Design a protein around this ligand. Sequence first.
Ligand code: FR8
Ligand code: ZN
Length: 349
Amino acid sequence: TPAFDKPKVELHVHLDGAIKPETILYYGKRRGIALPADTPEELLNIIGMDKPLTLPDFLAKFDYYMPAIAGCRDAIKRIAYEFVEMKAKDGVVYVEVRYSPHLLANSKVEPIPWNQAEGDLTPDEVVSLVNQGLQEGERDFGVKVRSILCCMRHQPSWSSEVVELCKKYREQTVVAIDLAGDETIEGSSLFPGHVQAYAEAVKSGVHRTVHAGEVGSANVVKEAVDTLKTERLGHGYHTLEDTTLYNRLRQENMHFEICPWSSYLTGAWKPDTEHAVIRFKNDQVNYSLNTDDPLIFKSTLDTDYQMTKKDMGFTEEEFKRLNINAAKSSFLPEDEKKELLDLLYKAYR
Ligand SMILES: NC(=O)c1cn([C@@H](CO)CCn2ccc3ccc(NC(=O)CCCCc4ccccc4)cc32)cn1
Ligand SMILES: [Zn+2]
């Protein structure tokens, strides 16, 4: 009813798509930007999807709300905080949250995002503020939280400062680097920018995830494993298109960060098909359940859980093992990771 009331782990959720409708009206109103509408209510319904659209119809969503938050220090910090209490309500005990620091900035970034005017919020103090509110979320709401800073495909030039933001803000709360945005652009996993950033990540012990095979071919996953050296995959559905690659990843115990509900809504999965997750369930792969963008997809974690237990016969035993897998493949230090494990066993039995 909730499908699974037991603590949970989430490894794959974007901050900048888990923003309360109510607080976007609050900052659009207080700053000029003025959204396409002005009850909370009527706002969620347009900035949210119920059906697949195209890529530019998807990005335009960002184009309503982002400029109302980006570039206000006030806002950056609250959304971080409000993110943590949103997760306490889902029953999460540990989450990793990801975002691009450049996309919330308005100076020392080129271009300037969202066609904002120039201010003085730089990439590097955005990571400082999210960290703040993420920490005081932690200690008010009971949810252990870390973060992930996203590289953007289209912009290899930002990547090297992503990886240095990762190193400078190390366990306080940044634990990994990611690559997001549009794995359709040719060759983008092999751009020199992204490549040397992941090399520097390897060099300096920052953990790695990549979004790959959501909408891209299995060759994009292969680029992610062999050349970017990821430790985990965002989505990775398209690895199923290549069977040796799939079998090998299974042997290697790769972690797949699955977004079930996300997948239907985006078009990455078409409901006339096998869901990739049930395959992963039947093959006992290492995967997690995640909601990706609850603002956009209209959703909550328990949405993912309900869709998996209703439409695909998951059971309570699977749900527990997948959260155990999630924890094991989390990017915590080994010590805090054993304590997380122990916690879950004790409440799973
Ligand atoms: N789910 C996501 O892809 C996502 C990305 N973000 C932020 C960072 O946390 C980036 C927002 N953003 C800005 C430029 C940009 C360019 C591309 C993408 N993402 C993609 O290309 C993934 C496509 C998402 C799946 C899909 C496919 C086809 C049609 C509709 C939807 C995000 C982008 C938040 N959520
Ligand atoms: Zn994602």
